[PDB]
Symmetry: C3
Subunit: 258 residues, 3 copies
């Protein structure tokens, strides 16, 4: 069973836009403590992991863990109906064939009620995140977006190099090249702008501009993105929600991978 | 002869945008009491009927019913010059080859004067609207636009079902389906939001999302669209003007038609 | 050597957008009194001539005339990083292979430093502007833009006819035709709106709508464009800068040329 309704349909429409783009399907599933989901591009280098806590729903009941996959573009079309304030109510029975998305106006005039035929995925969820990542930084999300779009002009691969007290994005391509370089610092004038960074061992990872571009669409969800990198493992970029989060595990380039 | 000038060129540029899109040509023609026009798509299921009363012109003289057809996209290009406030003056002689559209600034500096070569249509105007339509409703135009765009995401055909005190748009397609359902109601707090509906006999008509999408572009002309449906006849959607109107007669789907 | 930094990176990003579009390459070069540049489309009828005085830089040193060519689209990509306020510093050594464009935030956090591989052009600068042009006019730039976009709807060639106290743009095409006509006049209420025009001999020149469309993108640089026409010579359209300018020499149509 499943019955969950958000206050503002925007929140759910915001989140889904965050990965609607980098993955073809998403296998959603509700647990007693909230909703979670996961997706992997066909290119098999990008993993999307989502969690919306109960804390984010005005009503929520998942009395029996219903797993349900579905095409994202199809889900986005149904979410276009959005109304970003008028109540969105996910509804899905015990063993569903389609999830019913129900929007209702502030009164009872509009019964916008869509049903989206679910997909069929042979659920193989992955737990690849790890305990210790070589380096860990965070920074204003939009600062990060700029850097990622910018450098992706020059090259198809952005290189993220982290050394002691120095974070350096560098794109080197054909027309030329360029590199943004930032340093950790505080700002109690609005601490959520200060660049936090710990580095257990300096790291140098190169990723695909393509994918990174997708990963920054989660910026419309948080004030600060957090990036953790590991030499022997996909880097974990994350954006926090009011209860829950949205994380993208991107596999660093071998020479391919991106 | 013909000499008609609107106060704000916007009004005429607004109207023409309303059907510029769903028809290839329009056969314009002036009568002593105003200007009227009609168009039918090549697909032969959509009829556009327009009427701009004298009441809407600052000057108007049609001393001898000049019928003049013309391509819409071509007319739209000439209307792009629009200036939405600066005086547009339609001018066309007794037996014209082209209509002269003249814009002049608030003084005499700008003589924007275009001439558009008329087309040649063997005028066969149609009077297909009828006395009694099975059901009749009206509603905020934008409410209607939403419903039409929305449902057209799911399907290529929107179905409009009208029963006692229940108006229900339903699109059922491949990714899934969905239906908006509204009920008649008043609102003296701004009566032009209240949903008026009379139903002599309940009706169930299915149309083409494609066409309906075009029909809602007339929303930029009125606060409320009016829809009248008939079992044995094209549905009449209309948008009222300050003297005159703009109506689209769309032929309900057999299985084809849209 | 070369080291020049603008206060607001916008100014340089504004200028380059002005011709980024109508030319493939630009051969930049610094002289003791400022920076200048020139470009010619492959179509060989449009010349772009630029000059940014020292007066427009917060710092400037060109101790040895370094000529450097470069692709514009590539330059525009690097200028997208723009930040329109944060300091852009052009840097190029004595005999460069690439120009380094350096943006820095208001503090020292962001070292956006790009390098653009220069091109290789066998510099043949042209001095084709002349002493006396048959007619000379100026007018609000945006007034001019309108006229140029408008008429380019009807035709592929705009004709500029200048007679005593009458400036008349006329496009005559297939769907029809149209002509804007203006007259010289003063306005001490904001003199920079008054249409200045001297005519030593009346002129009638026809140009390519295509090119003229490009020439008006320099409007985002000045309040008034200035057009000087000559029977036996490319017309000179210009936009003035705070020290310097931007001029486009367009070759009038023979029947071809545009």
């Amino acid at each position: 069973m499943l019955e969950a309704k958000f206050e503002e349909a925007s929140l759910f429409k915001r989140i889904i836009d965050g990965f609607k783009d980098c993955v073809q399907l998403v296998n959603f599933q509700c647990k007693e403590d909230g909703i979670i989901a996961q997706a992997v591009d066909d290119s098999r280098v990008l993993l999307v992991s989502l969690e919306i806590g109960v804390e984010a729903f005005q009503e929520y009941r998942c009395d029996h863990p219903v797993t349900l996959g579905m095409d994202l573009t199809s889900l986005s079309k149904i979410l276009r109906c959005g109304n970003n304030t008028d109540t969105l109510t996910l509804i899905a029975d015990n063993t569903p064939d389609s999830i019913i998305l129900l929007f209702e106006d502030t009164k009872k005039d509009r019964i916008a009620e869509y049903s989206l035929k679910l997909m069929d995925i042979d659920a193989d969820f992955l737990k690849i995140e790890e305990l210790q990542y070589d380096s860990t930084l965070s920074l204003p999300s939009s600062e990060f977006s700029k850097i990622v779009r910018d450098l992706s002009q020059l090259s198809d691969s952005i290189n993220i190099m982290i050394t002691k007290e120095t974070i350096k994005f560098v794109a080197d391509g054909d027309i030329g090249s360029g590199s943004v370089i930032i340093k950790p610092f505080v700002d109690m004038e609005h601490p959520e702008t200060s660049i936090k960074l710990e580095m257990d061992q300096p790291v140098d990872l190169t990723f695909g501009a393509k994918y990174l571009l997708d990963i920054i669409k989660g910026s419309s969800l948080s004030d600060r993105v957090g990036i953790r990198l590991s030499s022997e493992a996909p880097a974990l970029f994350q954006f926090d929600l009011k209860s829950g989060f949205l994380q993208f595990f991107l596999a660093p380039k071998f020479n391919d991978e991106e």
